[PDB]
Design a protein around this ligand. Sequence first.
Ligand SMILES: *[C@@H]1O[C@H](CO)[C@@H](O[C@@H]2O[C@H](CO)[C@@H](O[C@@H]3O[C@H](CO[C@H]4O[C@H](CO)[C@@H](O)[C@H](O)[C@@H]4O)[C@@H](O)[C@H](O[C@H]4O[C@H](CO)[C@@H](O)[C@H](O)[C@@H]4O[C@H]4O[C@H](CO)[C@@H](O)[C@H](O)[C@@H]4O)[C@@H]3O)[C@H](O)[C@H]2NC(C)=O)[C@H](O)[C@H]1NC(C)=O
Ligand SMILES: *[C@H]1O[C@H](CO)[C@@H](O)[C@H](O)[C@H]1O
Ligand SMILES: *[C@H]1O[C@H](CO)[C@@H](O)[C@H](O)[C@H]1O
Length: 360
Amino acid sequence: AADDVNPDDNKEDFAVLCALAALANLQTTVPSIDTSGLAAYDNLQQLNLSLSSKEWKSLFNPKQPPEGFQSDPTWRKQWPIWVTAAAALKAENKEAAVLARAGLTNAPEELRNRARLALIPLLAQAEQIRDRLSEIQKQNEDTTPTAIAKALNKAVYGQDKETGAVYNSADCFSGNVADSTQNSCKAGNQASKATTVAATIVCVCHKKNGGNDAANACGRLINHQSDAGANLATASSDFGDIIATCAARPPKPLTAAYLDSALAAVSARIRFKNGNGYLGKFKATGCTGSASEGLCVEYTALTAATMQNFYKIPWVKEISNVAEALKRTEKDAAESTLLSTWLKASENQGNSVAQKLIKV
Ligand SMILES: *[C@@H]1O[C@H](CO)[C@@H](O[C@@H]2O[C@H](CO)[C@@H](O[C@@H]3O[C@H](CO[C@H]4O[C@H](CO)[C@@H](O)[C@H](O)[C@@H]4O)[C@@H](O)[C@H](O[C@H]4O[C@H](CO)[C@@H](O)[C@H](O)[C@@H]4O[C@H]4O[C@H](CO)[C@@H](O)[C@H](O)[C@@H]4O)[C@@H]3O)[C@H](O)[C@H]2NC(C)=O)[C@H](O)[C@H]1NC(C)=O
Ligand SMILES: *[C@H]1O[C@H](CO)[C@@H](O)[C@H](O)[C@H]1O
Ligand SMILES: *[C@H]1O[C@H](CO)[C@@H](O)[C@H](O)[C@H]1O
């Protein structure tokens, strides 16, 4: 009976599935967009405004530019930035602190004017940097620990929640379990069912009731204290025994590379026979939990040339979406470090122009 499903026959599949299951209820840090440069740019805006004429300052003390400028593209772009700067300078002692940092406390009118003009090229250089940093901030704002946890809890348990996700067949199998194990343990088909990591573990590892089971296929250390019932009717109790043996922890912070390597590893283990793909040992008839048949997920009609469809199965899609988001955020976080360092440097440069202008 070496060709039947025996204890340990799905042990190596189970190690990969354990790694994936450990993405449930995850508490990870995400790469941070370093937005300290936005504050540095806002300080430069405040200096520029403080040094401006009374006629210019009068424009801010409105939701839109004044008559004549409501259609000027530069005024439309800058209005909120200017308004924020004006608002921040209303705060007690703020303008005095801004001028002091710039060397401009009690500055003569001519020096205030020459200093403001000296900021023109500096601000023009910094604008493009600040706008890229603001774009990065916006583009990555949905890449958060909470959004990742929810997506991964959909992947593992079919539950769109940040924490407290647990095995429930109503969620782990699409529409709950099917009339038969064979139909429940199919994915990608018209009647796709095994659409989460947890359902995949049930199908690859469960002990069916009624004899002729493949208990301990996923490892001899599982203590199957019950069974999954007939046709997975009571899978939850058995799943709890299986998952109790899994200790996996992903690297922290979670990376795109780690998720991509996990999906690649599964892709490398799926085997094609007679027009379907299989994860877990398949002998004949279907993925039924019976030892002489199979303990597996049947990727119905999956072939090497249609493998793109594996990436559309819910759990795979959710993990893929997390990986893609992380892939962008990792790069944009590293970019933002330098954008923010550059903008802080521009702030320091702005605070130095008065010394040059005093000396001539
Ligand atoms: C730092 O703080 C200063 C203020 O101290 C602030 O300066 C102001 O910047 C704005 C935005 O660039 C300047 O707006 C221009 O205003 C002129 C008209 O100027 C008169 O009216 C204003 C408001 O009453 C007075 O402040 C000023 O002293 C003058 O009395 C407009 O003609 C400009 O429009 C052209 O440029 C825009 C910028 O790209 C275009 O969007 C627009 O379409 C216009 O360009 C077209 O027409 C041009 C003329 O024919 C042509 O040459 C172009 O190719 C194009 O075809 C613009 O609205 C304002 O004057 C500044 N005020 C002062 C006193 O300097 C800085 O903005 C602030 N720095 C930062 C980085 O925020
Ligand atoms: C697993 O159970 C099925 C259904 O009873 C049986 O057909 C196989 O022979 C057994 O190994
Ligand atoms: C299922 O059928 C195989 C032979 O095909 C047998 O070895 C198993 O014991 C039985 O359950």
